[PDB]
């Protein structure tokens, strides 16, 4: 029940993300309202510019927990396909690497060390070898629906808002001024 | 019912009930008021009601009840306490009593105490059984009280860097010299965190004199243990009153074999207080400062001992220095070597955002060897040694590019001593 | 039964006397308080009870009689002594008195004193019979006090350094002078040993001035000679009154032929209480200091002297230096050249850990010649001839691994020659 679990919680920080994101475009538009508007409102302006800062704030934020739910939900779709492949497959797996396998039970720490890493470099270059002719693959039968659903890639919109970096101190304060935002707008 | 319920329960909630018990207008006059007017009320129903806060003892046995929530403040709701029980339960100021209250009749306009059920949160003959705090003997501190919370916090740098910067153990007496504009304020906020997080055991008090109300309402709503504060409006009297209540409550606690820690800001506000209440003996020193003025602190932070029968008593006290006047470079000098444990804010480094800004070749704790153990005292004297040439700034600077790039103080000491 | 041995028993046996007798509320409150009343309950039984302690005379005669077991405290249970029995004795602040007690009657509540049986360790009138301090004439060091214990022990070794550095004899106004954080206490530990293990005919005392109380504790169960000191939460009255009486008893007890020495620590400290406990003369020199307000710790220091008569009276004073004080630093010249030996610690060699860190090159003593044999002052001689030109730093570790290799300062000497 974890892929379930994983797709679901992705699912909600999809639908706050983009609830952040209307909230965020509902204040950049009053804000500019106002400012075409005659009357000059110097301290309306001021906390409307607190409260678009605040608000790309927590829309950054919600993008970066999204992608970093997504990544772990394809991580972990990742895990298992190939743990049920390799399940599959294994015999067949320890055939074709046989010469540098086995005895990883009783091989040095360096000696399984560097094993392993052969190993990996092995599989990369059959990986490279097979992808050279380009056929498409589709999903996993088992578990196609959700991945079809969360997508390949997060949205371009998810990503374009995470390139700003934000330092502890500013992530402190805008976190506080968000609380107290949160509890003014409550009462 | 209880009186403390009473008094956190908010104004509105207050005003509402009494319109529920029948009083047409409560609202219009101070909390205090509202107070004795609902315990009237509810006195008048004929129920029993609960009572409980710190005892105190005037210059007659006159006694007096406070709570720690309305900071010790003398309010018309401060329950009365008669000379009798003063005497059969030998009680003194610092005693947390608890029990049932008598509402006050005719003659008289203090509820008196019916009879007492705790005393210092314990049955009132063990109380009596109790030894008297400075017939303890003390030591040095041998508890290691660790200040990184280990929970990968992004603002835990400042614990870390105090774990590393000074060894703080279960008995210290501290001293956070630091100028104006520092992160004094903060850096108390981040030790406080850090007892509530590490240590829920031992009991966190908090003690502000003549502080801003601002930063006074934002600590009590961020620190999990009680804290008592004062601000600059009430004169020294009350600061007196607040500091010597707090020290008596420690002294009574500690007896019980508990852990006490207070947080003091500032020490120099404190002994300007103690200046300015007590009666001239006749000679000044240099900075119009009385020479027997300084004696009533230093019996506050001389307090901070580690007993050998059980508890102990920790006083981190922060000094204010540069702020422009002889009498706070006075105060400072004279507590120069008495805290055991000091550690030194630079202006420099907190003017240039390189945070928490403190002086590390400046500041140290004394017999650090016997609050940690070895290896991790030969790891930090390499750090101290590595970093000891650099000024402070840099050394600050490495200090956080270092720290941040992991997670726990054991990666940074094993990666230094990879390197 | 006997005052001192009840007032050196601990805490926990006021317990079981007050059960014993009937006195269950007598824990609360101060112990010299409790010994009081508990000698009246035993003296109402009607039984006989031992005294002593050291005599004082206040200026109209009101004279008392303190303990050393509470550091010369102004208590309770302080023993009175009228006039008439100081006019027909003759006796001042210092002396040892043993003998008879009197339960105070209806008018006053001090114990009284029916009559003596020892005073300073000998028979009244054989001690009627002695020479005033004042009128004995001084003289250089001649006896040797070595401070090498011997048992090569780990500790030992700083002391071994202490008998190649400056040789310390019988009479000598010593004076250390260190940096803060520079292992001066546990110099005086290492002082405190040799003078307990070599010479135990020697009476020792250590004085310590405003000093925190966890080494105040830990100095009392380390040394074997009886130790005196006052909190830095006393005030400045409490250290001049205790400076007084510890050098009366030592020149009451110097003046029976003894050899009494004095460890203190530190003179700096005394020097601070002293000027602001006297009142101003109108005549301030730089740094806040009156004329006469180092007047008195001068006598203090120089009270040390060599007497042919009998007895000697050797001080070993500590002096703070670099603390960041302009105050400390004045008290310290005017102390440069008054100390016929003298011993300065370097804060650079500590920061290596190296211990103990001593500057050899600067350190010595005057009139060595009178100390010690010749054979080994040549040798000493030598010593520095080849140690000078080195760092201070190289100095002391080359010193240390010299004598760590070696088992005695003479297996040292040939050690050295050989090469
Ligand atoms: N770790 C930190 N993260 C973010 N801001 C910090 C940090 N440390 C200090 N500051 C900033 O530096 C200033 C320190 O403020 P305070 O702690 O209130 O100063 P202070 O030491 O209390 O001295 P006073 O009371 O203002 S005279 C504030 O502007 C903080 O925002
Ligand atoms: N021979 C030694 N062996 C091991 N450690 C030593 C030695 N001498 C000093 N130290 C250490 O050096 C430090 C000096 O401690 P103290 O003697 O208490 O300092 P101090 O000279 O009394 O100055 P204060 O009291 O701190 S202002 C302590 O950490 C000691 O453990
Ligand atoms: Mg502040
Ligand atoms: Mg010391």
């Known amino acids: 029940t974890a892929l379930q679990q994983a797709f679901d919680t992705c699912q909600n920080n999809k639908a706050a993300w983009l609830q952040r994101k209307n909230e965020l475009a509902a204040a950049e538009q009053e804000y500019l309202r106002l400012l075409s508007g005659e009357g000059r409102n110097v301290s309306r302006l001021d906390e409307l510019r607190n409260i678009i800062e605040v608000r790309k704030w927590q829309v950054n934020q919600a993008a970066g927990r999204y992608i970093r739910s997504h990544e772990a939900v394809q991580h972990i779709s990742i895990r298992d396909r190939l743990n049920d492949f390799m399940q599959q497959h294994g015999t067949a797996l320890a055939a074709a690497l046989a010469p540098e396998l086995m005895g990883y039970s009783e091989l040095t720490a360096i000696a399984r060390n560097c094993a392993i890493q052969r190993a990996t470099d092995a599989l990369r270059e059959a990986l490279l070898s097979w992808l050279a002719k380009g056929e498409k693959i589709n999903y996993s039968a088992q578990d196609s629906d959700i991945l079809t659903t969360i997508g390949f890639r997060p949205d371009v919109a998810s990503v374009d808002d995470s390139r700003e970096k934000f330092t502890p101190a500013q992530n402190m304060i805008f976190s506080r001024k968000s609380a107290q935002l949160a509890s003014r707008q409550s009462v | ?419």
């Open chain 2, 1 to 419: 019912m209880n009186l403390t319920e009473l008094k956190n329960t908010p104004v509105s909630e207050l005003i509402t009930l009494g319109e529920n018990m029948g009083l047409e207008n409560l609202a219009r006059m101070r909390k205090q008021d509202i107070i004795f007017a609902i315990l009237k009320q509810h006195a008048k129903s004929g129920e029993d009601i609960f009572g409980d806060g710190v005892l105190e003892i005037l210059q007659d046995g006159f006694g007096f009840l406070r709570s720690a929530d309305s900071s010790y403040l003398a309010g018309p709701d401060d329950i009365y306490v008669s000379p009798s029980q003063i005497r059969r339960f030998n009680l003194r100021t610092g005693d947390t009593i608890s029990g049932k209250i008598r509402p006050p009749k005719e003659g008289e306009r203090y509820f008196a105490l019916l009879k007492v059920n705790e005393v210092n949160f314990d049955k009132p003959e063990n109380a009596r059984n109790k030894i008297l705090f400075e017939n303890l003997t003390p030591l040095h501190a041998n508890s290691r009280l660790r200040m990184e919370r280990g929970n990968g916090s992004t603002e835990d740098l400042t614990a870390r860097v105090l774990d590393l910067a000074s060894l703080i153990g279960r008995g210290q007496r501290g001293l956070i010299v630091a100028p104006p504009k520092a992160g004094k304020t903060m850096l108390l906020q981040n030790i406080a965190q850090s007892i509530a997080y590490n240590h829920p055991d031992c009991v966190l008090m908090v003690l502000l004199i003549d502080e801003r109300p601002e930063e006074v309402t934002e600590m009590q709503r961020l620190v999990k243990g009680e804290v008592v504060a004062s601000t600059f409006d009430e004169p020294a009297s009350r600061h007196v009153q607040v500091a010597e209540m707090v020290i008596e409550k420690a002294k009574r606690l500690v007896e019980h074999k508990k852990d006490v820690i207070i947080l003091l800001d500032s020490i120099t506000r404190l002994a300007r207080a103690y200046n300015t209440v007590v009666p001239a003996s006749g000679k000044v020193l240099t900075g119009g400062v009385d020479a027997n003025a300084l004696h009533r602190p230093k019996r506050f932070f001389g307090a901070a001992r580690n007993v050998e029968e059980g508890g102990s008593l920790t006083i981190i006290a922060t000094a204010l220095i540069d702020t422009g006047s002889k009498m706070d470079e006075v105060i400072y000098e004279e507590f120069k070597g008495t805290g055991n444990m000091e550690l030194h804010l630079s202006r420099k480094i907190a003017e240039k955002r390189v945070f928490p800004a403190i002086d590390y070749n400046r500041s140290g704790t004394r017999k650090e060897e016997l609050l940690t153990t070895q290896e991790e005292l030969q790891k930090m004297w390499i750090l101290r040694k590595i970093i000891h040439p650099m000024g402070e700034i840099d050394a600050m600077e490495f200090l956080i590019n270092k720290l941040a790039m992991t997670k726990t103080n054991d990666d940074f000491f094993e990666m230094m001593k990879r390197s």
